Structures are given as C-alpha cells and as structure tokens.
C-alpha cells in the first residue's frame, strides 16, 4: 500500500520540520489540511517504521521503551501541580529517541534520518548469475533512484539463498557505486544421494529436482526476506525457482510473491505448482485464495493448449461436492473457516476463465448456476450471506 | 566427381567452358543414361517445346530417372524453358562435334607417380622440385612451417596416401584446379585441356605441372606436341593376409613396403617378398596419425594376392574385425570457441532465441531443459542485440 502510494504521488513525510514537502498539493503543517488518503498512509508508514525500529532494537527493549513512557505518564497523571509535571504525559520525537537510547545504548539516528526525515521508499532490481568455475553466486542489484517517489539506500541488505545444502543468509553492503555482489555457494551432494533438503525452519522435505539445473545448487533467492526496509523488489529468477519457492517455502510472503511472479510464466509446470498449492491444506489459506486467481490468469493465457476440463472445476468437485454426485454441491457446513473461504473464492476466480472466442465457457457458467440452485443452508450454524454474495460476484 | 565439379559452377563460366573442340562431348559422356537421348533429339530443333511433353515422354515406371536427369541437366543449364530448347551456343558446338565444323608411356607415368609418392612419404631419396613441394603443401595434405626443414605429412596426407591411384590422382587434380583459381590461373582454359586429353603462359605452366605429375610426356625436349599417358585420360594384388595378423607382400618397389609399414610392423624383407605384422602398436599409430580402419581394409583388399581371392570374403573376418575394434578403442577430444548465457526466465521465450543463433550459424549446442545456449564470440554482437530487442518487446 505505501510503496504504491509513494510511487504514485511524492511521498509521506513523517516528522516534518517547519514547506518541507512541496511535491504535493496540500500543506502538511496541520492535520486539517491533509488529504484523507495521506492521513491513512501516514498512519500506515508510522507503524511500519516502528516495526523497523523493532528490527534494529529488539522487541523486549521496545516494550521497555513503551513501558517507560507509560510509567512517566502515570507518575505525571496523579500530581496536582498545574503542568509542572503534567507535560511528562506528552511525548516528543527527541524524548522518544532519548528513552530508546536510555534503554538500549544504541541510537537509531541513521534509521530515523533515512525513513522518517527523508520521505521515500526504495526500488530494487535484482538479477543473478551462477559462476560454476569458482562456485559463486554473482548478484546484481541496482536501484531506481530517479523516480519521483524514490530514494537511495546505502545500508546493509539481507539476502536468503536456498541451495541444496540448506537455507543460508548473507548480508550485502550496497554502497552507491556497488553493482555486483559475489556470495559463496555450497555443495550439491544432496543430488548425488537422495537426501532431504533442509528448509528455512528446522524441517526438511523431499523435492523433485528434475526441473533444477544440473550445474547450480541454488534453488531460490530472496532479496530482503524480512521486509527490513521500505522496498519494492523486482527479482529475476528462473520459473522453476519460482515454482520451488511456491511449493517448499516456509514463509507466506515468499509464497505470495512467487504466485505474483508465476503469472509471467504460463508453462504447465507452473499450473502444476499452483494446483498443488490449491489442493494442499497446511498451506496458509490466503495463499490458496491467491493461487485461484493466478491459476485463472494462467489458464486464460494457455488456451489452445489446455487439455481437460476448465481450471479448478475438477478440484472444486473433488473438495466441496458429493462423492456420488459431482455436479451437486455438498450442503453447507461452514465450520472449518478455511475451506469456507476457499469455497467462496474459487468460483469467483473460475468465472474469469475465457474461451478462444473471449467468451466465458458455458461449462463454468452452468457450474456456477448449479452452485446457486443446489445451495442448502438449513444445517450449518453460520449464515450464508457472504457465500451467496460471492456467488453473485 | 566431375559431375560435382561441373555442377559447382555459374552459368557465365559454364557457357564459356562449353568450348567447341571437346567440352560439349566430355560433358555429354557424363550424361549417365537418358539425357544423352534427349540431347540428341533436340540437337536439331530451333523451336522450344512444352515441358509437359518431356514430363510424359517417360513411362510411369522408372520415372525417377527422368526427374533426376532433368534436374542434372537443368543444373548444367544445357537448355532454357523460354516460356526447353537447348542453349544456342551448346547446340552449335555439339553440331560441330557431330558431323560438323604407349608401353613406355604407362611405365613413365607409373614411375613418376611412384617418385611423387616417395617424396610425399618421408623417403630420404626422392625427386626434388620446389614448385611441386609448395603445391602439395598448399593442397592441404602437407604442412612445412619451416622452409629449412623438409615438410612433414599432415593427417589428411596419410588418408590421401592410402587411397587407390585413380581416386588419389583425381582428388589431386581437383585440388590442383581449386588452387589454380586461387593462384590466378584461369580455370576454364586449364579445364578444357583435361577434356580434350580424353579424345599461352598458363597453358605451358599447366602442362609442365601435368608432366611433373607424369600424366604427359613431350619426349622431344619440351616440344609443342605431347603424348598423354594412360593416367592422362582419367592390376593384380600382391599382399597375402594370414589369420594371425601376418602379411606376406610380394613387393619390390619401396613405395608398397612404406605403405604397409605405415600400419604394420615389418619383420623380414626378402628380395621378392616382405613379412610384416599387424599389431595394436602399428594400427593405433596409424589411427592416431589420422587413418581410419576403412582405408586400411580397402587398401589390403585392393592389394589382395590372387591366392586369397578364392575364399569369400577375401580378407579374413578376424583380421577385419580386429582392425575395426582397434580403431573403435579410440575416441578423441574436440576444439571450438563459445559463450554461454543463463537465467532465461520463460520457457516459450527460450525457444525463440534458439532460432536466432541457428540461422546465423553461431549456435553450437542447445539445452531446452536448463535453458543453456552456447554462442560463438564471432557473432556475440548480434545475438545480444536480438535478446535486448526481445526484452524490449516483452
């Protein structure tokens, strides 16, 4: 939301100094002259910058800062002196930074100078190349700092590389003149023997390594995984790396960004990846709800190649319909709250299917109308208004 | 073949090459079967005729002969559709060609070719001729790299050596013509003389080279008249092969003994016989030098003593199979120049890039499973631009 708004119009400036922001058509000196979208993005950027301050100075020290502010205010709140002490209930920026420096011993003045006083987000364009001879991974990260909403980042940058030997984090120093970052790569001895490949968490899984390159061990790369800067990343992986990142990652933002990047690769391996995500309980439900729409877009792009039925129909009849009647939907029992959301989002994406004539097929429209006719809600303890409203959608 | 040589020519050189004296007859004799008949038919016609008649003028059976003859003579451009009348110049020359307008020599040719082959091989005693040496060096079968030291023999040299005399001489003359064009000698004038044989400064030099090769011999202190030898127009065996890789060759000329020693170990040399052994060492030595088992087998078969001709096959299966297996035992490294890309993103997009390097001729190896295309540095400035254009198209 904030990178869309700041690249759209100028930027949000937390803590201006009194104009400080002349790129935008109102004055930021008073709350009653702000646009309402600017007020909403102001609150949004403020809580993300506080998450960044928690990233630099750990969460227990952050809660100690907040407790110190509240305790000064509550010793202030019981005095009777007319504001000799009642102004300890008012916080400022300098007092907040001083309380942070009191509890931690680190000051955050570079982070405050970059993300508060400066009003911009950063844009990262990354592309890699694997050097087989020296066994290194040559990243190439360049910033677009000449757009109207952007600024230049010179700090450190975390990158997480999943190779066959596991998941390794690397810190890159991205100075102004930097372009190529050579990080080292590990072995490929988990392709010699079939062993399980260890993940970002402690677990390990069986991966189908037939799509991987023979010479490179690395399975996927993620630039800034923890969202530790206010950034927009445009990484150029290969399509099998996006499919491996969709399947076997233990991070929901990486599964979402792989869904978002698989729309450019309409190959049938990506259809298999999104269909395996859709069938998979123990995936987070908002990833499967995105995979519905991604599968609809991919299915629209590979018409005159699609083999069987329309997308997600057989999957809908496998998950939510009767075993004896495929075209009759099961009676509504909405007590699971994840297959309820997936059931009410799957025909909405299924209706975006189009034939070679650019008209929605009469197999999906008839399916949606049979979902509407055979709807029986006399048996669940929950209402049907959102599911029926999504059927109209 | 001569058909290949003449097919590899332009119309402008072809019509000029169709000289009055002989060319119209020498090229006629090339016509394998039927095109002779059609040439005779429409030798007397001044009016072109429709192609359908020629098409239907051969029965349904054996039509492939009709199409192949028509294609061959279309390549030779003997006629033109003109809408199939023959070329007027060829018609006139052919009408003028059709009722219009030694024992010591063969030995000389044999001896001259034998001494030429002796020089080709590392024979201490051989005929000396700087022009012949440089001609053989530039023919592609010899490389010197050091004028002071005598030139060595390249890999193609051994293969050329093991060929039979007819094909050997024919290929040598083909290379002679190809290098004649490079050195600037007119190709048509020299070529017409070869055709005239089977019935200027450049002419004198060419005849001198032919005499050095032994095809012709003036015999009169280099007079205008010449008496071509048998080889100019265009024998029993002596080797006996045992089942224990033993060769008994009734050879008196050192050339045959040298040729056998090229791929066999010599044991004894009698006045009218020589004993050699075909061992792994000798055979693999020849293979490394460049020969392949096919040349050795063909050489032994062609120089097969009459005694072993009765048995079928002439060459024992054990010897032939052993030679072939010995050659197979060796498989060898290669050399090329290339550059490789990576991170090709979409699959259907990588298939379009494969056709760019294949049409230009800079593609070496492709990989659709990993997306891995090797591009030679000679055309690197053209593939990258195409890739950039594709990216721009998105």
- DSSP secondary structure of A32-88: GGS-HHHHHHHHHHHHHHHHHHHHHS-HHHHHHHHHHHHHHHHHHTT--SSSSSGGG
From CA B126, how far away is CA B115, in angstroms rounded?
A: 6
Through-space distance between the first and last CA atoms of chain B, rounded to whole angstroms: 52
* Residues 309-348 in B contacting A (C-alpha not used; CB under 8 Å): 342-348
List residues bridging with A182 in a β-sheet.
A138
Q: Answer whether A236 sits within 8 Å of B345, measured CB to CB.
A: yes
Nearest in space to A372 (alpha carbons), one of A334, A344, A335: A344
CA-based nearest distance A210→chain B, Å: 9
Report the 10 Å Cβ neighbour count for A365.
Answer: 14
Through-space distance between the first and last CA atoms of chain A, rounded to whole angstroms: 24
Chain B positions touching A234 (Cβ under 8 A) are none
Strands (E), chain A: 122-131, 136-143, 156-163, 166-173, 180-184, 197-198, 204-205, 218-223, 231-236
Chain B positions touching A258 (Cβ under 8 A) are none
Structure tokens, A363: 């197999």
Residue A213 dihedral angles phi and psi, to the nearest 5°: -65, 150
From CA B364, how far away is CA A236, in angstroms rounded?
A: 26
Closest to B343 (Cβ–Cβ): which among A214, A236, A264?
A236
CA-based nearest distance A197→chain B, Å: 21
From CA A142, how far away is CA A126, in angstroms rounded?
A: 7
User: Residue A307: helix, strand or coil by DSSP?
Assistant: coil
Residues of B41-73 as b/e, b for ≥16 C-beta within 10 angstroms? ebeeeeeebeeeebeeebeeeeeeebeebbebb
Report the 10 Å Cβ neighbour count for B273.
Answer: 14
Q: Answer whether B345 sits within 8 Å of A129, measured CB to CB.
A: no
Cβ–Cβ < 8 Å for A63, A53? no
Long-range contacts of A354-357 (CB under 8 A, 24+ apart): A354/A300, A354/A303, A355/A303, A356/A303, A356/A304
For B104, B133, B160, the CA distances from B166, given in Å and listed in that order, are: 19, 21, 11
List, in sequence order, the alpha helices (H) in B77-138. Answer: 88-97, 103-120, 130-136
From CA B201, how far away is CA A171, in angstroms rounded?
A: 80
For A34, A97, A319, B111, B179, the CA distances from B213, given in Å and listed in that order, are: 102, 101, 89, 10, 16
Q: Which resolution in angstroms does this entry have?
A: 5.8
Q: What is the dihedral of CA B322, B327, B328, B329, to 10 degrees?
A: 90
List residues bridging with B240 in a β-sheet.
B248
Angle between helices B103-120 and B201-213 (to 10 degrees): 80
Chain A positions touching B347 (Cβ under 8 A) are 239, 265, 267
B387 touches chain A (CB under 8 A): no
Strands (E), chain B: 142-143, 152-153, 216-217, 227-228, 239-241, 246-249, 265-270, 273-277, 339-340, 374-375
Locus of tokens 């299915």: A299
From CA A59, how far away is CA B269, in angstroms rounded?
A: 99
Q: Which residue of A has its CA nearest to B344?
A: A238
Report the 10 Å Cβ neighbour count for A282.
Answer: 4
Residue B45 dihedral angles phi and psi, to the nearest 5°: -105, 130
Chain A positions touching B371 (Cβ under 8 A) are 238
Locus of tokens 């010793």: A75
DSSP B277-309: E--HHHHHHHHHHT--HHHHHHHHHHTB-GGGG
Q: Answer whether B346 sits within 8 Å of A239, measured CB to CB.
A: yes
Q: Answer whether B343 sits within 8 Å of A237, measured CB to CB.
A: yes
Angle between helices B165-183 and B201-213 (to 10 degrees): 150
Based on the number of CB atoms within 10 Å of its own CB, is A83 exposed (0-12), middle (13-18) or buried (19 or more)? exposed
Helices and strands of chain B, counted as H and E runs: 20, 10
Half-sphere exposure in the Cβ direction for A149 (13 Å, CA): 17
Approach to solving: cryo-EM
Angle CA(A120)–CA(A121)–CA(A127) in degrees, nearest 5?
A: 145
A301 touches chain B (CB under 8 A): no
């Amino acid at each position: 939301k904030i990178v869309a708004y700041e690249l759209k119009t100028g930027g949000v400036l937390l803590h201006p100094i009194f104009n400080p922001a002349s790129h935008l058509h109102f004055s930021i000196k008073h709350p009653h002259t702000l646009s309402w979208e600017y007020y909403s993005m102001f609150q949004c950027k403020a809580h993300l910058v506080m998450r960044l301050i928690e990233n630099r100075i750990s969460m227990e020290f952050m809660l100690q800062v907040f407790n110190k502010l509240l305790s000064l205010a509550s010793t202030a709140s019981s005095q009777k002196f007319q504001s000799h002490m009642w102004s300890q209930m008012l916080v400022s920026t300098s007092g907040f930074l001083k309380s942070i420096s009191n509890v931690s011993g680190k000051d955050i003045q570079p982070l405050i100078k970059q993300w508060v006083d400066q009003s911009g987000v950063v844009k990262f364009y990354g592309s890699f190349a694997f050097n087989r001879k020296r066994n290194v991974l040559e990243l190439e990260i360049k910033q677009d700092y000449t757009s109207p909403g952007t600024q230049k980042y010179v700090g450190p940058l975390k990158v997480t590389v999943q190779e066959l030997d596991g998941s390794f984090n690397h810190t890159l120093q991205i100075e102004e003149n930097s372009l190529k970052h050579d990080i080292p790569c590990h072995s490929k001895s988990r392709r010699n023997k079939k062993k399980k490949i260890p993940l970002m968490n402690g677990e390990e899984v069986d991966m189908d390594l037939s799509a991987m390159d023979a010479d490179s061990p690395l399975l996927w790369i993620r630039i800034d995984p923890d969202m530790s800067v206010l950034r927009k990343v445009e990484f150029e992986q290969a399509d099998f790396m996006w499919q491996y990142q969709l399947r076997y990652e233990r991070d929901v933002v990486a599964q979402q960004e792989s869904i978002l990047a698989l729309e450019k690769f309409p190959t049938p391996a990506s259809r298999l990846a999104l269909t395996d995500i859709l069938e998979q309980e123990q995936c987070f439900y908002r990833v499967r709800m995105s995979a519905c729409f991604c599968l609809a877009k991919i299915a629209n792009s590979m018409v005159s190649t699609w083999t069987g039925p329309p997308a997600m129909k057989s999957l809908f009849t496998r998950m939510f319909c009767c075993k004896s009647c495929p075209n009759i939907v099961k009676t509504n029992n909405f007590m699971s709250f994840q297959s309820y959301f997936l059931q009410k989002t799957m025909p909405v994406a299924m209706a975006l299917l189009r034939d070679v004539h650019n008209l929605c097929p009469k197999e999906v429209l008839t399916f949606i109308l049979d979902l509407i006719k055979y709807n029986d809600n006399r048996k669940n303890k929950f209402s049907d208004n959102y599911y029926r409203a999504e059927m109209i959608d | 073949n001569l058909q290949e040589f003449l097919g590899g020519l332009s119309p402008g050189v072809l019509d000029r090459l169709y000289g009055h004296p002989a060319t119209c007859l020498a090229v006629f004799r090339e016509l394998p079967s039927l095109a002779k008949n059609w040439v005779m038919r429409m030798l007397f016609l001044e009016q072109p005729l429709p192609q359908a008649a020629v098409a239907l003028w051969v029965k349904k059976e054996f039509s492939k002969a009709q199409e192949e003859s028509t294609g061959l003579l279309s390549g030779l451009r003997i006629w033109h559709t003109q809408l199939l009348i023959l070329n007027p110049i060829f018609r006139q020359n052919l009408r003028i060609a059709l009722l219009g307008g030694v024992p010591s020599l063969d030995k000389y040719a044999e001896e001259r070719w034998e001494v030429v082959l002796h020089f080709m091989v590392g024979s201490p005693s051989a005929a000396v001729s700087q022009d012949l040496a440089q001609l053989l060096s530039q023919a592609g079968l010899m490389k010197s790299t050091e004028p002071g030291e005598p030139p060595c023999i390249t890999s193609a040299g051994f293969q050329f050596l093991l060929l039979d005399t007819p094909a050997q001489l024919w290929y040598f003359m083909l290379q002679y013509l190809q290098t004649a064009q490079s050195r600037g000698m007119d190709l048509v004038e020299i070529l017409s003389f070869l055709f005239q044989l089977s019935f200027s400064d450049s002419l004198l030099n060419f005849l001198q080279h032919l005499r050095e090769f032994g095809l012709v011999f003036q015999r009169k202190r280099k007079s205008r008249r010449y008496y071509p030898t048998r080889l100019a127009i265009n024998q029993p065996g002596f080797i006996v092969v045992e089942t224990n890789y033993r060769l008994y060759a009734y050879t008196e000329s050192e050339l045959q003994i040298a040729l056998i020693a090229l791929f066999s170990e010599m044991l004894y040399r009698f006045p009218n016989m020589v004993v050699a052994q075909v061992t792994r060492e000798s055979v693999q030595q020849a293979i490394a030098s460049g020969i392949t088992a096919q040349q050795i087998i063909h050489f032994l078969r062609t120089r097969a003593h009459p005694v072993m001709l009765k048995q079928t096959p002439v060459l024992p299966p054990t010897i032939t199979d052993q030679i072939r297996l010995w050659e197979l035992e060796r498989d060898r490294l290669r050399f090329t120049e290339g550059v490789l890309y990576n991170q090709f993103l979409s699959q259907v997009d990588f298939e379009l890039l494969l056709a760019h390097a294949r049409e230009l001729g800079v593609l070496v190896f492709e990989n659709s499973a990993k997306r891995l295309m090797v591009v030679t540095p000679a055309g690197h400035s053209d593939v990258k631009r195409f890739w950039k254009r594709q990216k721009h198209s998105s």
